[PDB]
Design an enzyme around this catalytic site. Structure first.
Site, PDB file in Angstrom:
ATOM      1  N   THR A  66     -11.181  28.826-117.651  1.00  0.00           N
ATOM      2  CA  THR A  66     -10.491  29.030-116.363  1.00  0.00           C
ATOM      3  C   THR A  66      -9.192  28.203-116.339  1.00  0.00           C
ATOM      4  OG1 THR A  66     -12.641  29.398-115.402  1.00  0.00           O
ATOM      5  CG2 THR A  66     -10.847  28.954-113.863  1.00  0.00           C
ATOM      6  N   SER A  67      -9.286  26.888-116.572  1.00  0.00           N
ATOM      7  CA  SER A  67      -8.130  25.973-116.684  1.00  0.00           C
ATOM      8  C   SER A  67      -7.485  26.097-118.082  1.00  0.00           C
ATOM      9  CB  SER A  67      -8.464  24.536-116.378  1.00  0.00           C
ATOM     10  OG  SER A  67      -8.907  24.383-115.016  1.00  0.00           O
TER      11      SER A  67
ATOM     12  N   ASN B  38     -18.011  35.838-113.683  1.00  0.00           N
ATOM     13  CA  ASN B  38     -18.247  35.329-112.322  1.00  0.00           C
ATOM     14  C   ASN B  38     -18.198  36.461-111.291  1.00  0.00           C
ATOM     15  OD1 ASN B  38     -15.550  35.657-111.750  1.00  0.00           O
ATOM     16  ND2 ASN B  38     -15.146  33.450-111.651  1.00  0.00           N
ATOM     17  N   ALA B  39     -18.344  36.104-110.013  1.00  0.00           N
ATOM     18  CA  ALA B  39     -18.485  37.100-108.932  1.00  0.00           C
ATOM     19  C   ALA B  39     -17.117  37.544-108.404  1.00  0.00           C
ATOM     20  CB  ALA B  39     -19.354  36.546-107.827  1.00  0.00           C
TER      21      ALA B  39
ATOM     22  N   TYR C 290     -25.256  27.507-106.556  1.00  0.00           N
ATOM     23  CA  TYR C 290     -24.081  28.347-106.195  1.00  0.00           C
ATOM     24  C   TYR C 290     -23.253  28.676-107.434  1.00  0.00           C
ATOM     25  CZ  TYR C 290     -21.801  30.953-102.572  1.00  0.00           C
ATOM     26  OH  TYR C 290     -21.381  31.998-101.807  1.00  0.00           O
ATOM     27  N   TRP C 291     -23.486  28.010-108.574  1.00  0.00           N
ATOM     28  CA  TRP C 291     -22.739  28.196-109.842  1.00  0.00           C
ATOM     29  C   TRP C 291     -21.368  27.513-109.750  1.00  0.00           C
ATOM     30  CZ3 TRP C 291     -23.842  33.823-108.481  1.00  0.00           C
ATOM     31  CH2 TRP C 291     -25.057  34.267-108.999  1.00  0.00           C
ATOM     32  N   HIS C 292     -21.082  26.769-108.697  1.00  0.00           N
ATOM     33  CA  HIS C 292     -19.781  26.052-108.556  1.00  0.00           C
ATOM     34  C   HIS C 292     -19.906  24.560-108.925  1.00  0.00           C
ATOM     35  CE1 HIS C 292     -18.519  29.371-105.464  1.00  0.00           C
ATOM     36  NE2 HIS C 292     -18.879  29.911-106.611  1.00  0.00           N
TER      37      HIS C 292
ATOM     38  N   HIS D 130     -14.868  28.752-103.130  1.00  0.00           N
ATOM     39  CA  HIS D 130     -14.794  29.586-104.370  1.00  0.00           C
ATOM     40  C   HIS D 130     -13.669  29.030-105.201  1.00  0.00           C
ATOM     41  CE1 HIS D 130     -17.274  32.174-101.811  1.00  0.00           C
ATOM     42  NE2 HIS D 130     -17.796  32.625-102.974  1.00  0.00           N
ATOM     43  N   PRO D 131     -13.992  28.127-106.166  1.00  0.00           N
ATOM     44  CA  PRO D 131     -12.961  27.293-106.781  1.00  0.00           C
ATOM     45  C   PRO D 131     -12.163  27.862-107.959  1.00  0.00           C
ATOM     46  CG  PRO D 131     -15.115  26.657-107.599  1.00  0.00           C
ATOM     47  CD  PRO D 131     -15.373  27.729-106.562  1.00  0.00           C
TER      48      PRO D 131
HETATM   49  C1  LIG Z   1     -22.255  33.257-112.370  1.00  0.00           C
HETATM   50  C2  LIG Z   1     -21.052  32.566-111.763  1.00  0.00           C
HETATM   51  C3  LIG Z   1     -20.434  33.131-110.676  1.00  0.00           C
HETATM   52  C4  LIG Z   1     -19.300  32.518-110.084  1.00  0.00           C
HETATM   53  N1  LIG Z   1     -18.601  33.203-109.131  1.00  0.00           N
HETATM   54  C5  LIG Z   1     -17.479  32.641-108.683  1.00  0.00           C
HETATM   55  C6  LIG Z   1     -16.661  33.344-107.787  1.00  0.00           C
HETATM   56  O1  LIG Z   1     -16.903  34.500-107.391  1.00  0.00           O
HETATM   57  N2  LIG Z   1     -15.481  32.746-107.388  1.00  0.00           N
HETATM   58  C7  LIG Z   1     -15.163  31.459-107.718  1.00  0.00           C
HETATM   59  O2  LIG Z   1     -14.139  30.994-107.241  1.00  0.00           O
HETATM   60  N3  LIG Z   1     -15.879  30.786-108.610  1.00  0.00           N
HETATM   61  C8  LIG Z   1     -16.991  31.339-109.069  1.00  0.00           C
HETATM   62  N4  LIG Z   1     -17.740  30.666-109.985  1.00  0.00           N
HETATM   63  C9  LIG Z   1     -17.310  29.312-110.418  1.00  0.00           C
HETATM   64  C10 LIG Z   1     -16.071  29.279-111.239  1.00  0.00           C
HETATM   65  O3  LIG Z   1     -15.932  30.424-112.037  1.00  0.00           O
HETATM   66  C11 LIG Z   1     -16.128  28.041-112.137  1.00  0.00           C
HETATM   67  O4  LIG Z   1     -16.348  26.889-111.333  1.00  0.00           O
HETATM   68  C12 LIG Z   1     -14.881  27.884-113.008  1.00  0.00           C
HETATM   69  O5  LIG Z   1     -14.590  29.149-113.641  1.00  0.00           O
HETATM   70  C13 LIG Z   1     -15.025  26.827-114.053  1.00  0.00           C
HETATM   71  O6  LIG Z   1     -13.815  26.721-114.840  1.00  0.00           O
HETATM   72  P1  LIG Z   1     -13.728  25.638-116.033  1.00  0.00           P
HETATM   73  O7  LIG Z   1     -12.403  25.890-116.702  1.00  0.00           O
HETATM   74  O8  LIG Z   1     -14.142  24.275-115.609  1.00  0.00           O
HETATM   75  O9  LIG Z   1     -14.820  26.131-117.113  1.00  0.00           O
HETATM   76  P2  LIG Z   1     -14.999  27.443-117.954  1.00  0.00           P
HETATM   77  O10 LIG Z   1     -14.249  28.608-117.387  1.00  0.00           O
HETATM   78  O11 LIG Z   1     -16.506  27.637-118.202  1.00  0.00           O
HETATM   79  O12 LIG Z   1     -14.274  27.113-119.342  1.00  0.00           O
HETATM   80  C14 LIG Z   1     -14.818  26.190-120.333  1.00  0.00           C
HETATM   81  C15 LIG Z   1     -14.678  26.902-121.650  1.00  0.00           C
HETATM   82  O13 LIG Z   1     -14.930  25.926-122.673  1.00  0.00           O
HETATM   83  C16 LIG Z   1     -15.681  26.534-123.715  1.00  0.00           C
HETATM   84  N5  LIG Z   1     -16.281  25.439-124.457  1.00  0.00           N
HETATM   85  C17 LIG Z   1     -17.251  24.527-124.001  1.00  0.00           C
HETATM   86  N6  LIG Z   1     -17.553  23.620-124.902  1.00  0.00           N
HETATM   87  C18 LIG Z   1     -16.690  23.915-125.974  1.00  0.00           C
HETATM   88  C19 LIG Z   1     -16.523  23.302-127.224  1.00  0.00           C
HETATM   89  N7  LIG Z   1     -17.153  22.178-127.559  1.00  0.00           N
HETATM   90  N8  LIG Z   1     -15.600  23.845-128.072  1.00  0.00           N
HETATM   91  C20 LIG Z   1     -14.967  24.969-127.695  1.00  0.00           C
HETATM   92  N9  LIG Z   1     -15.038  25.632-126.539  1.00  0.00           N
HETATM   93  C21 LIG Z   1     -15.923  25.032-125.717  1.00  0.00           C
HETATM   94  C22 LIG Z   1     -16.600  27.495-122.964  1.00  0.00           C
HETATM   95  O14 LIG Z   1     -17.134  28.473-123.812  1.00  0.00           O
HETATM   96  C23 LIG Z   1     -15.655  28.068-121.890  1.00  0.00           C
HETATM   97  O15 LIG Z   1     -15.022  29.293-122.273  1.00  0.00           O
HETATM   98  C24 LIG Z   1     -18.838  31.274-110.588  1.00  0.00           C
HETATM   99  C25 LIG Z   1     -19.543  30.633-111.607  1.00  0.00           C
HETATM  100  C26 LIG Z   1     -20.564  31.297-112.284  1.00  0.00           C
HETATM  101  C27 LIG Z   1     -21.277  30.591-113.424  1.00  0.00           C
HETATM  102  C1  LIG Z   2     -25.844  39.312-107.148  1.00  0.00           C
HETATM  103  C2  LIG Z   2     -24.858  38.806-106.116  1.00  0.00           C
HETATM  104  C3  LIG Z   2     -25.116  39.592-104.854  1.00  0.00           C
HETATM  105  O1  LIG Z   2     -23.665  39.273-106.536  1.00  0.00           O
HETATM  106  C4  LIG Z   2     -22.716  38.368-106.498  1.00  0.00           C
HETATM  107  C5  LIG Z   2     -22.767  37.127-105.733  1.00  0.00           C
HETATM  108  C6  LIG Z   2     -21.539  36.286-105.406  1.00  0.00           C
HETATM  109  C7  LIG Z   2     -21.670  35.195-104.664  1.00  0.00           C
HETATM  110  C8  LIG Z   2     -20.454  34.383-104.515  1.00  0.00           C
HETATM  111  O2  LIG Z   2     -20.269  33.767-103.328  1.00  0.00           O
HETATM  112  C9  LIG Z   2     -20.278  33.349-105.610  1.00  0.00           C
HETATM  113  N1  LIG Z   2     -20.069  32.545-106.406  1.00  0.00           N
HETATM  114  C10 LIG Z   2     -23.044  34.699-104.212  1.00  0.00           C
HETATM  115  C11 LIG Z   2     -24.074  35.437-104.485  1.00  0.00           C
HETATM  116  C12 LIG Z   2     -23.952  36.695-105.277  1.00  0.00           C
HETATM  117  O3  LIG Z   2     -25.163  37.496-105.624  1.00  0.00           O
END
Ligand SMILES: Cc1cc2nc3c(=O)[nH]c(=O)nc-3n(C[C@H](O)[C@H](O)[C@H](O)COP(=O)(O)OP(=O)(O)OC[C@H]3O[C@@H](n4cnc5c(N)ncnc54)[C@H](O)[C@@H]3O)c2cc1C
Ligand SMILES: CC1(C)OCc2cc([C@@H](O)C#N)ccc2O1
Ligand SMILES: *[C@@H]1O[C@H](CO)[C@@H](O[C@@H]2O[C@H](CO)[C@@H](O)[C@H](O)[C@H]2NC(C)=O)[C@H](O)[C@H]1NC(C)=O
Ligand SMILES: *[C@@H]1O[C@H](CO)[C@@H](O)[C@H](O)[C@H]1NC(C)=O
Ligand SMILES: *[C@@H]1O[C@H](CO)[C@@H](O)[C@H](O)[C@H]1NC(C)=O
Ligand SMILES: *[C@@H]1O[C@H](CO)[C@@H](O)[C@H](O)[C@H]1NC(C)=O
Ligand SMILES: *[C@@H]1O[C@H](CO)[C@@H](O)[C@H](O)[C@H]1NC(C)=O
Ligand SMILES: *[C@@H]1O[C@H](CO)[C@@H](O)[C@H](O)[C@H]1NC(C)=O
Length: 514
Positions: free
Chosen positions: A36-37, A110-111, A453-455, A493-494
């Site tokens: 993401t970053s 992600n969502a 929340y996955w956040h 939603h970060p």
């Molecule tokens: C299922 C789910 C749903 C979500 N839905 C939402 C949403 O709708 N909206 C929202 O705002 N946020 C949502 N989030 C949260 C949000 O996406 C995350 O908080 C954010 O993307 C995290 O960014 P990051 O750069 O810290 O990590 P990441 O995007 O996970 O990036 C880290 C990267 O580092 C890589 N990596 C790790 N260790 C190593 C290593 N040693 N060597 C090489 N590569 C490595 C990983 O494979 C990954 O690609 C969701 C999260 C999840 C899990």
């Molecule tokens: C399966 C289903 C309905 O699909 C997507 C989804 C998104 C969010 C969101 O707020 C985040 N992160 C919470 C719950 C959730 O559950």
């Protein structure tokens, strides 16, 4: 804002297998984690300098269900074989969870909900932000990958519900994290095509950016004025590779809340007594590496309308200071979505259901990331969040659950009851229904039925591990930019904050060097 358009894989022209030893050498910057970053950071640095972006996962084209809204469930239903884009874990609390393993990071799985940070966050941090540049960088991200969602019937029901339940005012369509009910942005477009952080690599200079995939970074290398000088990484075959920075260049860890503190600890940056206890040589003692790791609670009910509802992506948000609420409408399934519910021991839905959700802000409860192996980065760390260890979090969950009861009593939600009776017992529930409305009944519900929340965030905080320039204190040429950096959520939603932050810090590095 972006338009409806295909997922842009132009950048694959400078993506290589980590098995390629001609990637070994000296760069101006090495970015660890193509997420993401990391993707917007590497693209931004590549405007001027030679950049190596190292990602442990493969490219999203290998897993096409990552590229549509309709494929979201598939990625969570898929068995974790070590190569899939979703890596499954369980916290020591016993709550199922996932992180991304794919170029684009968690924006690929992600969502899709897109929000800007709460505008009060920047002053809360005590960092000297260039606020004009923060907003320019939000627009750079939004122009690439964010759309104004089209109307979805269920999101419109829930928005009317939030307003009738008193979550005011009506903010209409707005990307801002403000009290009230709004339509926000999405990284799904109006045809369901996913757009993500990998597409920001298309903003990089193709003469200056190289991306290695299936590159597992095992160790940060240091000078022997302690400085990071490079990395060791392994390829999919298990062979090792080195890459270095040169002159005034720098290593940046962007490996997420889990991966950043893991790699810092493996590299001898972290608490002296803990690292000495594992016979890891300490390069820089810092008692906060892997500390102050947070996961905002998700609490929820599931209603089963007597008539089918249309499946929807989340776009309508009900915001208050003390809770953030959304609802998804979800097709039934016979293979569970790992981490949608807290354990594998959850009922399967036989019909379309509404997942109605509240998120605790902050949170104030925290835990830690520790190593499970002192050597192998492919071995997941131990992670513990200590859900509801802080009573303020629990009080906030009680307030949020009372508000979800208000939502279910609205005229907006009434047509979705199975029985025309006065109470919310008129709905049919999948799993545990909402509350007897004494504090202990809501606290029991909050504690017993919490999910992720996955956040999750934290583990390398500004003010603990990093300075206000995102540098690891006491080390030259090492920074951290990803969700490991802040202890409280910037908003509900970060991803929008962390997408912005990658480019923002990239622009600060370039400015500090001029
Ligand atoms: C299922 C789910 C749903 C979500 N839905 C939402 C949403 O709708 N909206 C929202 O705002 N946020 C949502 N989030 C949260 C949000 O996406 C995350 O908080 C954010 O993307 C995290 O960014 P990051 O750069 O810290 O990590 P990441 O995007 O996970 O990036 C880290 C990267 O580092 C890589 N990596 C790790 N260790 C190593 C290593 N040693 N060597 C090489 N590569 C490595 C990983 O494979 C990954 O690609 C969701 C999260 C999840 C899990
Ligand atoms: C399966 C289903 C309905 O699909 C997507 C989804 C998104 C969010 C969101 O707020 C985040 N992160 C919470 C719950 C959730 O559950
Ligand atoms: C946006 O962030 C600001 C600053 O963190 C929040 O304002 C604080 O809110 C708490 C209420 O829980 C107050 O005790 C503080 O006094 C507030 N700080 C300031 C500067 O006023 C605000 O609640 C957040 N808004 C939303 C909608 O989440
Ligand atoms: C979006 O889908 C519609 C069909 O509903 C189509 O007319 C339009 O061309 C599509 N745009 C894409 C796939 O980019
Ligand atoms: C990299 O090459 C190896 C074989 O050397 C292969 O097994 C692997 O799938 C390749 N990875 C990618 C991401 O192309
Ligand atoms: C940045 O944008 C927000 C809206 O997202 C706005 O309220 C704020 O005034 C802007 N700040 C500056 C410094 O322009
Ligand atoms: C660390 O190494 C010493 C020998 O130098 C040994 O006595 C001790 O048990 C080791 N601890 C671990 C956890 O490997
Ligand atoms: C809850 O968190 C705050 C710190 O943010 C603190 O003041 C209070 O002591 C915490 N409670 C517990 C039990 O840790």
């Amino acid at each position: 804002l972006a338009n409806t358009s295909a997922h842009d894989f132009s950048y694959l022209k400078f993506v290589y297998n980590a098995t390629d030893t001609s990637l070994e050498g000296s760069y101006d910057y090495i970015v660890i984690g193509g997420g993401t970053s990391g993707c917007p950071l590497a693209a931004t640095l590549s405007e001027k300098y030679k950049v190596l972006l190292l990602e442990r996962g493969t490219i999203a084209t290998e897993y096409p269900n990552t590229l549509t809204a309709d494929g979201f469930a598939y990625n969570l239903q898929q068995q974790d074989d070590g190569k899939t884009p979703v890596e499954r874990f369980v916290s020591e609390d016993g709550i199922d969870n996932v992180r991304a393993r794919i170029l684009g990071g968690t924006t690929i799985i992600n969502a899709g909900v897109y929000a800007r940070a709460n505008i009060s966050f920047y002053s809360q941090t005590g960092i000297e932000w260039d606020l004009d540049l923060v907003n320019k960088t939000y627009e750079w991200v939004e122009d690439a990958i964010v759309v104004k969602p089209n109307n979805q019937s269920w999101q419109s029901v829930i928005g009317e519900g939030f307003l009738e339940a008193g979550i005011l005012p009506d903010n209409g369509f707005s990307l801002d994290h403000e009290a009230g009910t709004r339509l926000t942005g999405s990284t799904f477009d109006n045809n369901g095509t996913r757009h993500a952080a990998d597409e920001l690599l298309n903003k990089g200079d193709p003469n200056n950016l190289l991306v290695a995939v299936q590159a597992s970074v095992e160790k940060i290398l240091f000078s022997s004025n302690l400085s990071a000088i490079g990395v060791i990484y392994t390829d999919s075959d298990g062979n090792s590779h080195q890459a270095f920075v040169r002159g005034n260049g720098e290593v940046i860890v962007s490996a997420g809340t889990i991966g950043t503190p893991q790699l810092l600890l493996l590299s001898g940056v972290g608490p002296e007594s803990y690292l000495s206890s594992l016979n890891i040589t300490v390069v820089q003692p810092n008692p906060y590496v892997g500390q102050f790791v947070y996961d905002n609670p998700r609490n929820f009910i599931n209603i089963l309308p007597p008539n089918p509802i249309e499946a929807s992506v989340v776009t309508v948000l009900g915001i208050r200071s003390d809770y953030y609420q959304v609802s998804a409408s979800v097709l039934p399934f016979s293979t569970p979505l790992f981490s949608l519910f807290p354990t594998t021991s959850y009922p399967l839905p036989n019909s379309t259901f509404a997942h109605i959700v509240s998120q605790v802000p902050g949170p104030l409860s925290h835990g830690s990331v520790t190593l499970n192996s002192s050597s192998d980065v492919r071995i997941a760390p131990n992670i513990k969040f200590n859900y509801y260890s802080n009573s303020t979090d629990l009080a906030n969950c009680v307030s949020g659950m009372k508000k979800l009861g208000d939502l279910l009593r609205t005229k907006a939600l009434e047509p979705y009851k199975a029985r025309d009776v006065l109470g919310i017992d008129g709905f049919n529930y999948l799993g545990v229904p909402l509350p007897q409305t004494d504090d202990a009944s809501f606290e029991t519900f909050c504690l017993d039925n919490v999910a992720s929340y996955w956040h999750y965030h934290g583990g390398s905080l500004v003010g603990k591990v990093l300075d206000d320039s995102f540098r690891v204190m006491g080390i030259k040429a090492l920074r951290v930019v990803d969700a490991s950096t802040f202890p409280y959520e910037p908003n509900s939603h970060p991803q929008g904050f962390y997408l912005m932050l990658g480019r923002y810090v990239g622009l600060q590095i370039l400015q500090e060097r001029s």
